[PDB]
């Protein structure tokens, strides 16, 4: 039904929000510290000197294990 189409759209948008803002391909699994922005996969977070969201210096990257993780890289 039309309701099925609406639900499919919501599901798609929620899944896309869990993907890396730089490569758009891998799941987010890294946090920039100390600011806390958690928007990249491990590969894209590794070379950034400053946070792509707030410009704060990246002192280090903390790996995050999230319950929503499903990709073969996070399992």
Ligand X SMILES: COc1ccc([C@H](N)c2ccccc2)cc1
With CB under 5 to 8 Å by kind, the binding choice for 24 among a copy of itself, Zn ion, ligand X, none is: ligand X
How far from 61 is each of 48, 68, 71, 72, CA to CA, in Å? 10, 20, 20, 21
- Specify the residue, 11 or 59, whose C-beta has the smaller distance to ligand X: 11
Under rule CB under 6 A, residue 17 binds ligand X? yes
Q: How buried is residue 29: exposed, middle or buried, by Cβ count under 10 Å (0-12/13-18/19+)? A: buried
- Specify the residue, 24 or 64, whose C-beta has the smaller distance to ligand X: 24
- Specify the residue, 23 or 59, whose C-beta has the smaller distance to ligand X: 23
Could you tell me how many residues of this chain bind ligand X (CB under 6 A)?
Answer: 6
Closest distance between Zn ion and the C-beta of residue 10, in Å? 24
């Amino acid at each position: 039904s039309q309701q099925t189409r609406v639900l499919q759209e919501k599901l798609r948008k929620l899944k896309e929000a869990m993907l890396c803002m730089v490569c758009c391909e891998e799941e987010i699994n890294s946090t920039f510290c100390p600011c806390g922005h958690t928007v990249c996969c491990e590969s894209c977070a590794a070379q950034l000197q400053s946070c792509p969201v707030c410009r704060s210096r990246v002192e280090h990257v903390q790996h995050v294990y999230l319950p929503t993780h499903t990709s073969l890289l996070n399992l």
